[PDB]
Amino acid sequence: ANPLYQKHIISINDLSRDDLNLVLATAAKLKANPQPELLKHKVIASCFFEASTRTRLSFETSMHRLGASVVGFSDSANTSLGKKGETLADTISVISTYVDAIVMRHPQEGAARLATEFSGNVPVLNAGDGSNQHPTQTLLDLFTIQETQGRLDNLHVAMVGDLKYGRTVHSLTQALAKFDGNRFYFIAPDALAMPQYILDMLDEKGIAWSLHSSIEEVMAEVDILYMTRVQKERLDPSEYANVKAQFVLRASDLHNAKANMKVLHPLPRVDEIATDVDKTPHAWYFQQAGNGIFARQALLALVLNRDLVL
Amino acid sequence: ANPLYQKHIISINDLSRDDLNLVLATAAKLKANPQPELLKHKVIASCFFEASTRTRLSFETSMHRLGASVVGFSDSANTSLGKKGETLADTISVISTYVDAIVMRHPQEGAARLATEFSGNVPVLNAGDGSNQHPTQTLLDLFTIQETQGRLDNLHVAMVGDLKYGRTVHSLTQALAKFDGNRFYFIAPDALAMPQYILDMLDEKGIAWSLHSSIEEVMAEVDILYMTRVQKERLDPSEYANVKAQFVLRASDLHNAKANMKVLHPLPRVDEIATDVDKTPHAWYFQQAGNGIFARQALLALVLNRDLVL
Amino acid sequence: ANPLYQKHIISINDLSRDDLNLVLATAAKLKANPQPELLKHKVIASCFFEASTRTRLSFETSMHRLGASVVGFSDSANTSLGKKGETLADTISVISTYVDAIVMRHPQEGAARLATEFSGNVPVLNAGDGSNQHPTQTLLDLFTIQETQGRLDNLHVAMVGDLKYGRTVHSLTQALAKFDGNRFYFIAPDALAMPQYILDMLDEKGIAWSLHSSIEEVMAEVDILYMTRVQKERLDPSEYANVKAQFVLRASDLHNAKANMKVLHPLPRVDEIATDVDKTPHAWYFQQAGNGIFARQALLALVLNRDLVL
Amino acid sequence: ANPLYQKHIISINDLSRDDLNLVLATAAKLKANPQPELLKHKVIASCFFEASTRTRLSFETSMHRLGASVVGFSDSANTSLGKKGETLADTISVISTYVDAIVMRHPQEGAARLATEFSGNVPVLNAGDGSNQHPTQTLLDLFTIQETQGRLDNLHVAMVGDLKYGRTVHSLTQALAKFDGNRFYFIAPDALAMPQYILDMLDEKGIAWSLHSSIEEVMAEVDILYMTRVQKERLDPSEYANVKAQFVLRASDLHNAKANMKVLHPLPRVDEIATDVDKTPHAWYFQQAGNGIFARQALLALVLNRDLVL
Amino acid sequence: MTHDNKLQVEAIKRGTVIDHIPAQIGFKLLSLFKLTETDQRITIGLNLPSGEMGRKDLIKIENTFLSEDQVDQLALYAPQATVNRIDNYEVVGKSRPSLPERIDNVLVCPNSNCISHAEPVSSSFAVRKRANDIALKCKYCEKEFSHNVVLAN
Amino acid sequence: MTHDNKLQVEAIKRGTVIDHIPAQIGFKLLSLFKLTETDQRITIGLNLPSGEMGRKDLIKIENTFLSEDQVDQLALYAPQATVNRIDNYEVVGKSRPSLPERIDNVLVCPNSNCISHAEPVSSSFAVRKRANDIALKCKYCEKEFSHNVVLAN
Ligand SMILES: Nc1ccn([C@@H]2O[C@H](COP(=O)(O)OP(=O)(O)OP(=O)(O)O)[C@@H](O)[C@H]2O)c(=O)n1
Ligand SMILES: Nc1ccn([C@@H]2O[C@H](COP(=O)(O)OP(=O)(O)OP(=O)(O)O)[C@@H](O)[C@H]2O)c(=O)n1
Ligand SMILES: [Zn+2]
């Protein structure tokens, strides 16, 4: 069967270099020659115990462009499961008798992994579990880095913002550290820096990384600028408004960038990327969100189909 | 046409022995040889004026495994119909011009029956109306009793918990009292006992029933143990924690049970069934929730198809 | 120094006959000559962690009528304490640092008595703790029986309504059993019966009691008729309304009551006592609420004053 | 007329050493002989636009202990002002039209000082303004250091906890720097460090301070140990719990503390100070809350009285 | 000598030997009454042959005299347990547990709404042999429960 | 059968002796690893006088042979213990513990947003980095903590 056939997709840590490449390969084929009746007669459950409109619609549009049916829910001040008394384990034990696959996003970490022990042979795919993991965002980021830069190794990647708590930046570094020769520049407020564990990992593999103070310091060498949003909740309004003469991106700042330099952002991009960046060649966050469709279609097709000869 | 063709499914009281058997027969066939394009081009409305995740997803997965389309809603602190001023009658009069069938769950009793007088020739199926009725739970319970025990008559059925207000236990007794020779054991807190009307009915038919004080008293003779949840709302915390040395189920208690004895629970099972029961042969509440799919598929196929030659 | 000086009025089972009569003879003196400056310069805390307007306005007015200042909060409307994880032991160890007595209502049973472990020498008076005690409602009830009947012994007292969950009928029956030759008539629907622990305590003291299903059976003999409100959520809609809602008093039923008979009701009354009853001389529910002023005044006077000159 | 007569107590940086000592010697006299009618006939407003029970009950009790009346509101529980678009300038221009002083807490920093522009001659006392000042918590802290240590200079004061966002450690360090030869020990996790602007101010005045990672390093030398609560939302779940949650005091750590050492904590304490600490003679957090009564009484006396005879 | 019994016994000099602990209450008692938080020599025997009473447990705590109050608490668990003190190599007192008046600390209120659950409080129940059983009234919520409801939770 | 005595107690007929338990880990080990839920005679020696640690604890379980990875769950608490396997009065085997790769069920994830708290799963930690000081990663939330921290609460 294909390597990922009937597999659970919970952590980027559990998918090897080749599994990542397999996904990215399939997604490039599904982008090219669509197959809209591939999951005809499958029913997938879209269990968003935590609400994400953008992520839920990317997933359900993925389910539907491969012809699958969808049952599910989202939850803010609403609809029953969990309540208190109803265990996650019993929700999954009950929903595993109804569906063919479970995509779920939950606020506590490891909820997707707990689920895997109750879904029987029904695959479960993680769409977010607290501050732990979000594999399908990493998968679409790497597909966007591969189709714009041409490769996934030997890249000069700049990571910016709340590096301490952007869950997508912790995953993306783990994954880009399975390919070879990548150099990392980490521009964060020191209140919001890369944890020592990411850094401690990167040195065992021998990867080169550096920490800078503002994007202007690396604009000239960088291929991917991955911008993250700085979270006003865990910052004082006065601290937040104080850092440097900022770390937001404007087209003036880009006058130095390489021609193939692209700016990525998992979104939402409230104010760290100004509207004038949107019209430059380097802006790629919306094209990045469209590639969510192809990355998610690839994962669902490999999980639910034994052999895909596309 | 088949007996139930274009019929309204509102109360278990209105479906005869043979109608129940017809449903159970169809469900066994749809479980065996699935027909996923049977309601191709039908649109069903899933109107949950009261939220139930488990019931809503079982129904919509039923609609989708027979190829139907779904429009609908659920409601807690949300989306418009009813509001106050908007009658249920006018909601149904408007939705009956859009869909081919209406599955609805509503908090006031008889809402499904009121609906029947406004839906024109659009069938309406009751998914819960207050404390009155829930036919499709009774239908899946009887399908689970029939496929595990082999028959629906001459059973020694034990009913446990809040017998006074479990709506599924009132229905299940009505329905099992249309088949022959069943013996009932009703183990309830006397604050929570079988109403005199169920009992008064059962004696007119000549059915044998008894009331016991704890499951341990009948464990040896029983074929179905149907466990219900005891509702802490209408009980004092001190009363609730006082009753007997309880009426919860643990595997220790099962050491006496017959080999074909199964434990059923409409779910959720918060604490009256401990986790160690889950690993015994007698545990059948999750398999019971999967049979919801087959029982609901059967009802929708018979209501919307004239003759089903499956 | 009087016996109640600086005591905690936590429970009716801690106050003796003599204690009860002392509060009731002081209530009668304050009712007759006011002492509006007796608690001058005392500051009292009125902590109602669970809102109860009726009880608060009355405790505070009687604080104001003896000249004390009041600081405090009504909550179940998020007035900030309980935030972070401030234990009740800690709140009461900070509040007793500056007030001279604490009046408190709280949702969990036992909270006033725990407050007592932390207040030092500041007396704690209980204004209600969950389904456990309410001393000051039993003290005003008693005062109203004594003032209108001339005695607290040799009474024929009927208790009507929800006798199972009604916190005040349970305490007034324990107080009246402190006295002699009282006779009880309980008239309650089957599901709202007076608990065995009350009945067992009554038997054990040789007190006479009996159950009747109609007020009409006992009207003639009755001196105090204490009516309780049934909350309809303790039963279902159709139960409440079915033959069990006839625990309602109308003026026509008073036809033959003794000239001295009084109708008492802790309130809110919603429909168990019809409005036409108010015009009769037997209606004493509002005069009973008025008497809450002198019974709470007396407890505050006796607890904060060493010696009292009357 | 005394220096504070009719002043606005908005910020600790506006009160001099002499001002501080005047409030603290008055607090000591009111603590020793009460003046319970000094503010007779004065009406004071207690405006807490952001709820804070601890602070309110204490400001109001100390108003009551000098004989003043109080009118006012606690909100963050929609008590109608702020409706339509009533600016704060307008609310304070109407409230100062009839009260003799305003005590106010508000969520935005700077609100008390703006109130000052609109009150005319009615003094405004700040009970907290966002993350900016809280004069009256620093005044009660100081009074508790002076009363237990005999002095406010030559102290060895350790500050433990979240030093970065803790509004009261920042002000007490500015007040103590008004005095002589005090020595500071800061013990904070890395993410909760004492801000540079405090440290720069300390350096510039020749005051000595040092950072330690364990209380055990400094216990022996310490006179006042001021503990702050860490709010877990300022860190993540796993950060809070990881090696950084060891800023918690237990009785065993007090082993070697000087006989005069006291533990102070503005409160709520949730777990940073274990309950066994309360039995030690060094626990002074509750006696510190009690002292809030005399420091707030003194400020109200000094601000509303021309001349004060002591 | 041998019909085994002893096999060169842990005969102690000063101490408390609690013998005839009902089987399985043996470990329960160490936990609940925190008997191992001591530095003195304890020797415990679990599931001993007690042909004479089926199975039993036995704790030997040395240079410790566990008494009066302490002995009576064990009543709820090991009601047939003989405590024996030993002053200098043999039995000096051999006490039996009697039901106490109050049971503190060890026991939880069944009442989910009782305040004892969220707070820094030591549980406390007033014991009443309501002939047939023992009822336990909580100090705080003042609800009364059979000792069997409490002894699970 | 052979001359027990009790400063160092003697001979069980076949079974396991976990000797050289540091002081006060003995009871912890009986609690955590539920060693008491056997009908076998267990004999336990607590605060005992020998083998230089000075005072040690000891557990003797007859007829049960718990081994190889059972012996290794012991490593975090009792790393210097010896687990003597015995047949017919002779120590036919002596093991010590080594860090296991996985410690199930006994620990509690310190991350409070971990899902493990609320559910019918048991804890599981991946273990690593011998004697310079152990890190434990939760199976579910994948947060790596210092063993000192999980082992506190
Ligand atoms: N120096 C001693 C003396 C007595 N014991 C213990 O103290 C207990 C006292 O029991 P004893 O009165 O000596 O004879 P028994 O018949 O066993 O007492 P009982 O009637 O309670 O069974 C015995 O378990 C014995 O091991 C001891 O350990 N060391
Ligand atoms: N049938 C036996 C034989 C021995 N032991 C126990 O086995 C343990 C240790 O085994 P042993 O090699 O016989 O003594 P040591 O040489 O001291 O073992 P080590 O040096 O590893 O501590 C001792 O505590 C002793 O009580 C036992 O209880 N039963
Ligand atoms: Zn209790």
Ligand SMILES: [Zn+2]
């Ligand atoms: Zn975890």
